Design a protein around this nucleic acid. Sequence first.
RNA 1: UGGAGGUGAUUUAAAUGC
RNA 2: GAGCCCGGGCUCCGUGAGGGGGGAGAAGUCGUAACAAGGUAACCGUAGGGGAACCUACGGCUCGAUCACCUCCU
RNA 3: GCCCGAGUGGUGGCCACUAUUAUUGGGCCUAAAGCGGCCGUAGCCGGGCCCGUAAGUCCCUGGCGAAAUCCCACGGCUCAACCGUGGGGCUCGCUGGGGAUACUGCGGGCCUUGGGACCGGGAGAGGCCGGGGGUACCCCCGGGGUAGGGGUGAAAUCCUAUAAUCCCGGGGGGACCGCCAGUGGCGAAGGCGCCCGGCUGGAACGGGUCCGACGGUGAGCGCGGAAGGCCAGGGGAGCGAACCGGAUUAGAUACCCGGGUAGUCCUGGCUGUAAAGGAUGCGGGCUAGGUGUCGGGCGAGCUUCGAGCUCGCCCGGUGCCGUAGGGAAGCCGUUAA
RNA 4: AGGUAGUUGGUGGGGUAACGGCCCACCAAGCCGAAGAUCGGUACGGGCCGUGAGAGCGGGAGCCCGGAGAUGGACACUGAGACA
Lengths: 63, 22, 158, 145, 129
Amino acid sequence: MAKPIIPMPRSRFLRVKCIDCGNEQIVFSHPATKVRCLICGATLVEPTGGKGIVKAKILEVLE
Amino acid sequence: MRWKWIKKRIRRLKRQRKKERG
Amino acid sequence: MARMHARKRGKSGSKRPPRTAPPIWVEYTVEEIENLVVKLRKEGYSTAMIGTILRDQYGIPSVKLFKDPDNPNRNLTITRILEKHGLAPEIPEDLMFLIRRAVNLRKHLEQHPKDLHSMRGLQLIESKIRRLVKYYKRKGKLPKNWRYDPETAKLLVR
Amino acid sequence: GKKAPNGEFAGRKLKLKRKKFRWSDIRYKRRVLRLKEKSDPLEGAPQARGIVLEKIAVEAKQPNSGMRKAVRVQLIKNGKVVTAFCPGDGAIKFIDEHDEVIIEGIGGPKGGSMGDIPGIRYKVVKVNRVSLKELVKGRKEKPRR
Amino acid sequence: TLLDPLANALSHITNSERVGKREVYIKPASKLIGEVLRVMQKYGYIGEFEFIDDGRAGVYRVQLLGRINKAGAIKPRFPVKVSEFEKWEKRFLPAFEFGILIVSTSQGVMSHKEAIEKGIGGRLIAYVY
RNA sequence: UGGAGGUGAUUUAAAUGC
RNA sequence: GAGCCCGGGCUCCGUGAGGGGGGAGAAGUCGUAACAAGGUAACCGUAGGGGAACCUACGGCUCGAUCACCUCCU
RNA sequence: GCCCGAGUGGUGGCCACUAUUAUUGGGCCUAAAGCGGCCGUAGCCGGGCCCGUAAGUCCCUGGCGAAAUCCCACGGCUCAACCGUGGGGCUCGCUGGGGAUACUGCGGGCCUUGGGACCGGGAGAGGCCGGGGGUACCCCCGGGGUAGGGGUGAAAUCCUAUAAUCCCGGGGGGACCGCCAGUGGCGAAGGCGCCCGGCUGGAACGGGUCCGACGGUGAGCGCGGAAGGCCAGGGGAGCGAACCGGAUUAGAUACCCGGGUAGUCCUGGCUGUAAAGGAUGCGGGCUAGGUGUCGGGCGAGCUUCGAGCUCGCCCGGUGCCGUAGGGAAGCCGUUAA
RNA sequence: AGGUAGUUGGUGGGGUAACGGCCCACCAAGCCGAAGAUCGGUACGGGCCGUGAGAGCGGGAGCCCGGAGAUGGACACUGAGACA
């Protein structure tokens, strides 16, 4: 890693735009849990190992 | 060796401890 | 980094964001954040998981950085947001989760007593409680009159 | 940490450690109790007079054989039986039975009889308050009673 | 856990030295070490350092000239009178020339030689030579 | 080129010496 | 309010039949135990048995055996 | 001839040598020596950042630690020893006042690197409980089938003639789970292995999401601990201390062979030992590398579309080889010695 | 490895040159201990002394300083002062 030369996680941010309601959500590239859309009740991502596996096609802007 | 000694020590102990018990 | 406690195994290297002031591409008011927290503590979720869902859904990695400064005595974060409202459990969650689990063990052993290993973690979880108790007394979340026992663990849970 | 506590207030642990571990020196232990002083008669002393009960000769050790001259003397106040090694060639002669014989040690009080002699802890200096090395030389004085 | 974070800095710094790397990284960081490296730099033993304060920790990246032979902390950290200095002078240091028996003092922190010129003393902290 | 196991193992070869 | 005495209990010093072991002496006897796979590998904790060294059982260990047979490793 | 010289030598004691008592200044794989492993009490030891006190701590002053002895000067006795005068030190363990605030203590505040804690994916001989299958050995019954078999270097004792071994069919019992199986995994340790399900311990990783120094270690103390043994109850195929025969042998209380009890299994309890080893206490930090391997993550290619087959970086573990260094050497060497 | 019964403290009192469980009447149940008490051994204590590069270790001799004793053990007078 870089524990003595400043450890920074692997992370990033990405704007996810829902395909069922057009709802714009901020999502941590590593979903630990099931993230639920706040105006669909859908599942955007499912938590597995490392980076949450995104369920099916949902739009993405990478920050 | 230490077989020997352990049983010798034990026999000494018993026999003598027999003589003390008696 | 590690501590192999009741283990020989190096600990996870999970590490914080080295962000010291918060993202502004992420946006929430002191008022909006406070609502989100109160809603989640109303569900039955607990502060670690409250910080978890907020992270995964609303994109706030830790509350302290976003919130404070809004009363710069100290950092404002989940349970310090809760205590000002009165939603805080008087037992620290740390100590609670611990004891919670513990009472479940006992019931297993109750029915099954031929269990080395299961017996041996009873001994391994109590003794973390003991510690966690000991220091709190002196810090003051739990009165000095208390002392820990398995009947005084079955009373706190019920 | 190579053993020891190091820390301001710990010292006491140090202080007891040493002492605890001092008693593995046989010599130190022995003196500090006084086992040197109690066991190997004398009551500790430099020397002791005693009455020559008889004269006895014993054998030499392992690579060796030769008749060492030894007395049996009884220390008088000590009241203990001591067998003893006599210096010199002719000697056993100049010592009459029931003359006074002053006795010493010989070669470390540890117990160590010299390499040849098995038992003998001790030495003789004297016959009727005149010594043996004075009686190996003819001129110096010659014995009585 | 750790204790003596300083020492675990220093000890790296020397074992760092003995290899002959170029620069160092010390993951735990502080005043003690900060200050000590400061005084160390002041005498010159080391080149330049930057610390970056991460929200975790201070880290010091240190530049190694080649000068340092040996530089170590003191174990119980004994108090030392200004009369007893000479004893502790002969023991730890390699000779009269060097004079960074770094102590901590009423005035601040100093080496041995900077302590003696003022005239003030106390408990020992570390050494450098 | 140098190291670790798992199992066949061989009775046709006899006590002592300062 | 001493020394003194008396009856009992407990402890310590001088000294005693008898009894235990040590470091030995190495010319008698029994055996070959270990050290070479010591000629049944050896040790080990435990248990029984044998005159003795010791043997055997069960579990362990290699500070384990010699090729052979099979398996891995720079 | 050498030493020393009115001395020189013997015995005894103490100190030195002896870093053979380790503060200065010792070790503990194999030389003596790690507790079989863990827990936490007493103790010692403690991440960063700010403020108060100034208890330790340093600085200055002041009260004081008799004389003597010691060390230095000068002076006195012919000289010195010895003494006189002047200066210093002295167990030196005490006290009063002022001053500093780095460190340490204490008090208060503040923070997430340590610790703990959570969520989701994941492997395994971890434990317990219930369930269930098959192997082989034995036993018992019917059939078939005769002159042996068993055992050894040779033999005997012993199996078999109301029939053994053997083969076929049927039934009953207790133990255990080859290959799988790995230089493999899990466990604190003793240790742990058919398959399935329930209950349950630990562990890894991604994200530090929460607590905010809560830490380390650990005398005492408490707890777990193979096999053997013991206790009470139940069970008993094979095996098998003791034991009973044969052989061997000069003799054999043996190695080899044929019987055989305790025990080995189950339940409850006790007992607590080992070459309980990696002969290597635990925790943190630092210090070339290489390779194989197990599990988790990641970027790709392949794909049977399952991380199934591979490349590399990373994290945790498990081996081997080896630079610097250490070691007496063997060896150890990012799983440190 | 647990010890302690005037034993720790309280009130009031006696006695003493004088404070004080010193002693005593009443009341209370403390006091001391693993930061090793109690018990057992050994031993006058200090200034110093010996040794050792130092750190340290051993030692209490003349002499000085302070305490204890006078055949063992108890006891008062007389005197400022003695239990001599």
